[PDB]
UniProtKB/Swiss-Prot annotation:
Classification lineage: Bacteria, Pseudomonadati, Pseudomonadota, Gammaproteobacteria, Enterobacterales
Family named by the database record: Belongs to the peptidase S54 family.
EC number(s) given by UniProt: 3.4.21.105
Segments on the Cytoplasmic face: 73-78, 123-132
Main location: membrane
Organism: Escherichia coli (strain K12)
GO biological process, one term: proteolysis
Protein name, per record: Rhomboid protease GlpG
Catalytic reactions on record: Cleaves type-1 transmembrane domains using a catalytic dyad composed of serine and histidine that are contributed by different transmembrane domains
MF annotations from Gene Ontology: endopeptidase activity; identical protein binding; serine-type endopeptidase activity
Entry's transmembrane regions: 4-24, 52-72, 79-99, 102-122, 133-155, 160-182
Cellular compartments per GO CC: plasma membrane
């Protein structure tokens, strides 16, 4: 059992971007991938999403990717690539927006998308067990610890609590909708 294409390309893209940052420096990469930081850049649409591709520390990308690999993988295998694509696109946009609004355009990471994924996987398993998707009991605990780490700023994750809540809201919403069909 190997992780699907969406799960795989995201991880590799994040690693490729991370390397570009070690070489060129965080600054340079952000100049090109950050959420529009100036009116002159408002129509460079990739920026509304590419901010999720940057990470600022080893622990940052390590945990983001472990979570993305486990949850993203599960969703893609059990619900398809399309399902993961939408959750990722929407959460990336919403969280980025909330982040930008309250703290400025200088941020990055897949943590907003991770919160959405934790929300979706957990909620869907609780409401629609047999759907096959669910967040392993023991992993709920480490998920909560990862959450607490960011919430009380014990672990630097780039994004603020408000942006992470927006990410979570997206995953909970989609999970609510999905366990609403049948
Ligand atoms: C939340 C994760 C979202 C990841 C989305 C990454 C999308 C990258 C899209 O880039 C686009 O690729 C084109 C290729 O030619 C360029 O021409 C264009 O200028 C550029 O904008
Ligand atoms: C702005 C949100 C849109 C998300 C942007 C997704 C960009 C996908 C770029 O990936 C490439 O897609 C090709 C599709 O054929 C594959 O052949 C190729 O292997 C893969 O590397
Ligand atoms: C403690 C916080 C971090 C938890 C990280 C759990 C990682 C579990 C990774 O599992 C892998 O997932 C892929 C996609 O589902 C499968 O293709 C693969 O066979 C499986 O081995
Ligand atoms: C939130 C979205 C994040 C980016 C998602 C990118 C998915 C890119 C999928 O690539 C696809 O991989 C297949 C297997 O290799 C190729 O056959 C195909 O040509 C290519 O299109
Ligand atoms: C720094 C924290 C690192 C935590 C490492 C946790 C290792 C145990 C995780 O087990 C994983 O559980 C998933 C759910 O059952 C399986 O799908 C997967 O195959 C299995 O590998
Ligand atoms: C993303 C974090 C989501 C909230 C975590 C909830 C912790 C409180 C326990 O809840 C649920 O209680 C059931 C009965 O004990 C468990 O069987 C189930 O596994 C667990 O989920
Ligand atoms: C509620 O939480 C708040 O969310 C904001 C949104 O990011 C953060 O700016 C702020 O620091 C945090 O206290
Ligand atoms: C459905 C989408 C979910 C969006 C969630 C938005 C929550 C943003 C939380 O706001 C925060 O509240 C604190 C107290 O009011 C302020 O101190 C802080 O500056 C502000 O950032």
């Amino acid at each position: 059992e190997r992780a699907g294409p969406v799960t795989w390309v995201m991880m590799i893209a994040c690693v490729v971007v991370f390397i570009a940052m070690q070489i060129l420096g965080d600054q340079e990469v952000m100049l090109w991938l950050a959420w529009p930081f100036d009116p002159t850049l408002k129509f460079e649409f990739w920026r509304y999403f590419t901010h999720a591709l940057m990470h600022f520390s080893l622990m940052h990308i390590l945990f983001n990717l472990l979570w993305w690999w486990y949850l993203g993988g599960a969703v893609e295998k059990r619900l398809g690539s399309g399902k993961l694509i939408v959750i990722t696109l929407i959460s990336a946009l919403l969280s980025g927006y909330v982040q930008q609004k309250f703290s400025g355009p200088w941020f990055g990471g897949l943590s907003g998308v991770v919160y959405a994924l934790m929300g979706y996987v957990w909620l869907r398993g609780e409401r629609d067990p047999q759907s096959g998707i669910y967040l392993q009991r023991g992993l709920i605990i480490f998920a909560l610890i990862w959450i607490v780490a960011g919430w009380f700023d014990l672990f630097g994750m780039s994004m603020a609590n408000g942006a992470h809540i927006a990410g979570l809201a997206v995953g909970l919403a989609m999970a609510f909708v999905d366990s609403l069909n049948a």
